[PDB]
Design a protein around this nucleic acid. Sequence first.
RNA 1: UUUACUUUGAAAAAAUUAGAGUGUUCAAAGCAGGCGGCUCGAAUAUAUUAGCAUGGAAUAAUAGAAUAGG
RNA 2: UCUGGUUGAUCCUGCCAGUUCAUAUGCUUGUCUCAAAGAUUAAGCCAUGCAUGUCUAAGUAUAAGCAAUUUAUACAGUGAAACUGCGAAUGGCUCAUUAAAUCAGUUAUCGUUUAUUUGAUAGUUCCUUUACUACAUGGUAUAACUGUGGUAAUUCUAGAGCUAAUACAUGCUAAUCUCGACCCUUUGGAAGAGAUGUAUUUAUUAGAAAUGUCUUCGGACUCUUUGAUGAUUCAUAAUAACUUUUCGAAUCGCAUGGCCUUGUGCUGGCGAUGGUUCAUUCAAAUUUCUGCCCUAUCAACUUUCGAUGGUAGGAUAGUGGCCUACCAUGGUUUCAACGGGUAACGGGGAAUAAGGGUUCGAUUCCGGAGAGGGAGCCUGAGAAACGGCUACCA
Lengths: 137, 244, 57, 178, 170
Amino acid sequence: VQSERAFQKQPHIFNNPKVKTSKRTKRWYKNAGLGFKTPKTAIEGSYIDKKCPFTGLVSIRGKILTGTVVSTKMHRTIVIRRAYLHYIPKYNRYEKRHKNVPVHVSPAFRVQVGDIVTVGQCRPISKTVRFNVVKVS
Amino acid sequence: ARGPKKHLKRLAAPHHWLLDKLSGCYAPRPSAGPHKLRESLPLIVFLRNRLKYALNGREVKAILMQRHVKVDGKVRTDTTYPAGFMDVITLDATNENFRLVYDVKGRFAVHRITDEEASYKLGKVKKVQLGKKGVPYVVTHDGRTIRYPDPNIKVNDTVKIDLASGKITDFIKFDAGKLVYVTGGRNLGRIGTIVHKERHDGGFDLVHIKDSLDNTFVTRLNNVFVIGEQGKPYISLPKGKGIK
Amino acid sequence: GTYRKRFNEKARSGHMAKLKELKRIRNKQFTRPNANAEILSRLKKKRLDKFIEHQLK
Amino acid sequence: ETIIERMPIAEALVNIVLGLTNDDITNFLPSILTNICQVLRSKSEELRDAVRVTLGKISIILGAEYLVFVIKELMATLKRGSQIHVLSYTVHYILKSMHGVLKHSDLDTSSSMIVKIIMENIFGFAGEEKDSENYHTKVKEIKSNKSYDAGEILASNISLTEFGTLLSPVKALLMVRI
Amino acid sequence: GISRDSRHKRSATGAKRAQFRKKRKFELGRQPANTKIGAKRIHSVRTRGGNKKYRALRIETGNFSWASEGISKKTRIAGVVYHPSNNELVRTNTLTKAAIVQIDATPFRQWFEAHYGQTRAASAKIESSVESQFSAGRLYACISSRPGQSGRCDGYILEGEELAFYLRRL
RNA sequence: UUUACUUUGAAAAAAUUAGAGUGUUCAAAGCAGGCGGCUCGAAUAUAUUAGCAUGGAAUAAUAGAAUAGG
RNA sequence: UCUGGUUGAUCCUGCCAGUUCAUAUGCUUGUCUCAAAGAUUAAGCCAUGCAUGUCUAAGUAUAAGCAAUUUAUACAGUGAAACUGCGAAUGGCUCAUUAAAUCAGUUAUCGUUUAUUUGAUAGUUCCUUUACUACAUGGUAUAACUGUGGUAAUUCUAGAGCUAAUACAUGCUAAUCUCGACCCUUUGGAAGAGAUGUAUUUAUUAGAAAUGUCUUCGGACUCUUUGAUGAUUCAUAAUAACUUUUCGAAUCGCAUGGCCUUGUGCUGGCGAUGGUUCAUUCAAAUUUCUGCCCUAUCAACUUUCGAUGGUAGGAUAGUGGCCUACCAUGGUUUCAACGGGUAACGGGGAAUAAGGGUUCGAUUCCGGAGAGGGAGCCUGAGAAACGGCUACCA
Ligand SMILES: [Mg+2]
Ligand SMILES: [Mg+2]
Ligand SMILES: [Mg+2]
Ligand SMILES: [Mg+2]
Ligand SMILES: [Mg+2]
Ligand SMILES: [Mg+2]
Ligand SMILES: [Mg+2]
Ligand SMILES: [Mg+2]
Ligand SMILES: [Mg+2]
Ligand SMILES: [Mg+2]
Ligand SMILES: [Mg+2]
Ligand SMILES: [Mg+2]
Ligand SMILES: [Mg+2]
Ligand SMILES: [Mg+2]
Ligand SMILES: [Mg+2]
Ligand SMILES: [Mg+2]
Ligand SMILES: [Mg+2]
Ligand SMILES: [Mg+2]
Ligand SMILES: [Mg+2]
Ligand SMILES: [Mg+2]
Ligand SMILES: [Mg+2]
Ligand SMILES: [Mg+2]
Ligand SMILES: [Mg+2]
């Protein structure tokens, strides 16, 4: 968890060294809403992820999309593939088309290449990331 | 553009004003105020095109600078002041009280009211929040902030505002069976009763409305304005009663 | 239209400078102060090559 | 999860409201009754049965004069697809429940509406769907035709003066090729 | 000269985009404020709207909070000991957010002696590392403010796991 | 079960197009109010795709602790 | 597309001959209504004139201005000049660039700024030099103006002398509210125990079987005590400090009412302009999803000098490789990436057609971008402005 130069913590969550009520460090978490269940690994995990929809400072609002994971080779973010049929009216026929969406995946989620993920729109996380994994299947 | 615009082409003006396309090149651009640009009737249009008391803009300015026009009980001297839905316009010299309500066509009607009915207006609650020092307040559709509201008042409810004091006299909750007025969309101007409110979290709510003729239509919740209980509106309605 | 001939290229040399920068970066794959201051032919040589070779022969 | 358990609360709401003044009864019942009819929109068959029994119980507590208001609200909310058949099964259930409480001539006020539901569900489009081999569904409301039973209940209550209301659609149907 | 526009960058596919328009004032950046320890030098910046930002060019004092004790004292900043982003900032003693600095322990020690009457006993007990620092005369603190934005060099005294982590990193 | 597909409803500025009324002297046009309650008057429509809500039994993909074992 | 020939007479396949729009131009041209004005891919160059200024009773007049007057005693009518404020970021024109860019429909700001309009909103009593301006502080100050001047020349200006403010810079003046013993039993009195703004920055905290008894039959006896969203570290409140630190009216017109202990005493009307925060409105900036003409004789591209992502910082109004440091090696692509061409601004729209389609759309509305070509800035709420400024090229 502390594999970085700076100390990783949830901002403004204070663990008071004097009182020592509980062994576990105090952990803040929220429910993202829209009927998406906060996983228990988020509640009782130890990771720090500012872009997590359940423990970070990021809110899910806007479009809710679904896709198939096609790449998981880069850290805490994946690339999903959304496929659709585009209608050419002159020939009265369809053509297969696709688009690749890069999505931030919280370490509370475990994903392989090929599984179906539902993702929720959030604010720009990086140059190309505007979505966040909220459900895996 | 490098800043806010100040002109409005006639073809770009709201259609419900009924402006002649060949009268000029520009239309009265409403000034900033209680109501939105597309949902407001500037006083020049009301005084000249609707009431015909003024023959042109100069006469409208002459009328206004005499302090003859009051909007919700306060004298307004700006020609493009954005009067809007449920506003009370008073002309004491002619002994006229008007309320701005759309007709079935979707256009603001010339609706004359009595002084007793002119003493108040209705406001749809757009927001309820605690201000500084923990003082609750409600923001209505006309931008009025009213402090210390009844705790039962919630968003989408309608508050009856006394114009002399600007305080809440009564209120109507948003519920099934309540009488509602459509303030947007193609059903603008229709009146009916709520049958059901379809809820979509993260999206736009939909409301089903049934008119007295039993015709049913669906509208977004933003376009619905509760005006009273069925058969007992809190305001006088224009001719047609919002039918068709 | 990016590199089309212009009526007067000398009058817009600064514009021409940007285009050359855009060309090199775009075509790179194929190859592989402060103003607001207080104080401021081929056929012929081939014929000769054949000729001189023809003499040396 | 608990929607079926809360449905009888509507019956409690009707009773407490019935004790209120004559201005309040007109103010709160339409809100209660209309909300019950909306739940019939639900795609859950078990939930729809829960609404029907609650509507049946409220129908006994209320009078036959209220039946026009209940039916009219049902017609508004159920209009498309299975909903038309939902409307037919429900109205018969209310009539079946109110069999004892109903007096003679009580159904005259709602006679016109009932025959429309009856005929539309025997000779109309809804009747054809019930008789279609291609239509494969497990919804009981559609497999079962209760219009015939609704007719027997209706004719028992109708005064002989208004019995022409039942015969008139029959005559029009007989006029067209059958 | 500085702009924050995303048009000058390559597309996600790797394409080189062409210039859509000239640079706009609403997507500008400004020179960094390399705040350094010394006599207070702060200059105002006129930002979008009538709003103003404060640039701390130099600052030697700041308001630091003892969160376990729930107090804040104004203290002199000795120097920058560790910075996670760039060690050159430590070398040049540049003050920014998250820079680990050493502050005078005197006001906190005096408050502790006055409040607890010790140089009751159970509450007066504190972490061993913090007491060792007090004996040394300087306390490790983390700057929580942004000096180039607000003009302040506030912070908080390191404790617990954060203190142990930064002691390891030092 | 989900999707595709299809129905219906919102949405898709005005001008332009189709349409209704009106003796601009006719016409191209412009235009919404008349009589002293009269049940008088633009009734209006229009947009392939994408998103939103909704009814669907077929068709085409997609699923099953399906008719399993002792 | 049709018509007539090619045979002694037909069918089929061929050959021959005739069969609106755009540009350029020729001739003629009386009356009514109405209406437009591009083009050398030359977004090539421009003489001259004009196109952005603005004053109410209500910011500042001893103009050596005019006119007045009961002929003026601080001023007072009207008012050049100049200061101050606001506007000049709108409008108008053109289509060069621009090929997931602009644009169209559809989304988000729980990701930010917002002059103006509209609605709300700020008694902090006290706190030693009271050695005390609030019946009201300074030049820490100048313009116009007077006077002496430089330059061939410009909406160039120097030195000296003056004088104002809603300019600039400072700075103040016996309150309210919780409980309440004791009397008294209400229209109650109150000995006394207590409490006291905003703005900035940081840290911490909150924000979740009384089914009885009596009573006059009413009522009283104990308890409750934040709100919103699908969703938040939200709204809001509290503690401890912090600040080259703000704000909390030294402003103006009209009028002269009410109390008296008769004082130029106390109090007082209707307006204008300001001012802190919040909401609203006019906006802006980013932003989700789908949709562009020709080219495969363009098959690999991006990544050294940011390309894809992680952590932290800086910068920003704010998200974000936007930039920096350190890390990984990612990201797009035969479902056509990347590169190239475009006589490519996009759309609403226009023409043709029976329908499918094809073409045109600089051009009355919307959006974008530019002001000879690149680059950078001041002011301001708002501009990378060009009828603003500075440099370089022509
Ligand atoms: Mg413009
Ligand atoms: Mg609608
Ligand atoms: Mg929302
Ligand atoms: Mg569609
Ligand atoms: Mg004549
Ligand atoms: Mg004078
Ligand atoms: Mg004057
Ligand atoms: Mg290209
Ligand atoms: Mg796109
Ligand atoms: Mg202004
Ligand atoms: Mg205000
Ligand atoms: Mg001088
Ligand atoms: Mg960052
Ligand atoms: Mg770098
Ligand atoms: Mg074109
Ligand atoms: Mg071009
Ligand atoms: Mg065009
Ligand atoms: Mg420009
Ligand atoms: Mg030119
Ligand atoms: Mg300005
Ligand atoms: Mg410029
Ligand atoms: Mg010019
Ligand atoms: Mg200009």
